[PDB]
């Protein structure tokens, strides 16, 4: 007869590649027994054993365990992690083949697309929740970051971090990262969750495998939006910015001969500038225009 409305197809395509991640730590105050400190999920990306998860899932782990839905359990090597995207890459050494998440480089995330969140909430076991893409390009709950979140109302709980957000074809849309739970009038928020889009996720992963960390250019300032531009609100004391003489209240209009149109696109711009470069930034103090040379440094670590 007729068939029930179902997203089972997407589950069967994508869910085998979403793993349970366990962060175990040594009980140093006892006798170094390994105890769970936190848990989450991960996504197997290719057949070489590379897995994307969140950094906060695996931070300071003495043992990272990766458990597949088909029963296989692995000790994982931390390939690297990036604190500003809250992404981290794990490697497992599986010789018999792996389930990999479906990826469509051509698919554009559209607001209103049906998405399925696949994770291990509260260690209940793999769980599928359904919603839509609620928004794109969100900064989440802290106002400064390069996370460029997809927003979704598929139910995300503790344990979903690092798992897959997937459309109805099984295609990876994002890595579920964070759920909203603070409020002004003390209400508890509902159906507001964020996931790093897969395009940026794969980009961070390839950098993590290549270099072991995410190398970014960095000037050493703190700016703000709107004579449109960026205003220096503070400068790090040994920032390249500082050594180059940029000061506070200075209106930045150009950075490496690209208009300082918005802090987010300028923040992306400087990050890809290889450290050690010398770029011009056009500045303004008291309506008088200056062009100063800044020697790009690498963004400090965490």
């Amino acid at each position: 007869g007729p068939t029930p409305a179902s997203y089972n197809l997407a589950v069967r395509r994508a869910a085998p590649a979403v793993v349970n991640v366990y962060n175990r730590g040594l009980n140093t105050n006892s006798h170094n027994q390994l105890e769970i400190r936190t848990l989450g999920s991960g996504v197997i990306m290719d057949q070489r054993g590379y897995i994307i998860t969140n950094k906060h899932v695996i931070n300071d782990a003495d043992q990272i365990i990766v458990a597949l839905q088909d029963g296989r359990v692995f000790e994982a090597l931390l390939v690297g992690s990036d604190s500003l995207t809250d992404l981290a890459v794990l490697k497992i050494n599986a010789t018999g083949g792996l389930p990999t998440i479906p990826i469509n480089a051509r698919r554009v995330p559209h607001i209103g697309d049906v998405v399925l969140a696949i994770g291990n909430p509260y260690n209940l076991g793999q769980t599928i929740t359904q919603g839509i893409i609620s928004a794109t390009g969100r900064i989440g709950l802290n106002p400064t970051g390069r996370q460029n979140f997809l927003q979704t109302d598929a139910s995300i709980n503790h344990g979903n971090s690092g798992g897959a957000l997937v459309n109805s074809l099984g295609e990876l849309m994002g890595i579920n990262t964070l759920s909203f739970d603070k409020s002004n009038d003390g209400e508890t928020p509902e159906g507001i969750g964020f996931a790093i889009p897969f395009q940026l996720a794969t980009k961070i992963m390839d950098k993590l495998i290549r270099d072991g960390r995410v190398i970014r250019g960095y000037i050493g300032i703190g700016g703000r939006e709107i004579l449109q531009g960026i205003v220096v609100n503070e400068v790090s004391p040994d920032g390249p910015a500082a050594n180059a003489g940029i000061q506070v209240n200075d209106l930045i209009i150009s950075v490496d001969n690209k208009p300082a149109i918005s802090a987010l696109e300028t923040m992306d711009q400087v990050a890809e500038i290889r450290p050690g470069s010398v770029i011009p930034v056009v500045v303004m103090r008291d309506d008088k225009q200056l062009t100063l040379q800044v020697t790009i440094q690498e963004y400090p670590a965490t």
């Binding site: 106002p143 400064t144 960095y218 000037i219 300032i221 703190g222 700016g223 703000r224 609100n233 503070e234 790090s236 802090a263 987010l264 300028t266 923040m267 400087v270 990050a271």
Partner: peptide, 5 residues
């Protein structure tokens, strides 16, 4: 608000 780059 304040962005560090």
């Amino acid at each position: 608000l304040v962005y560090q780059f």
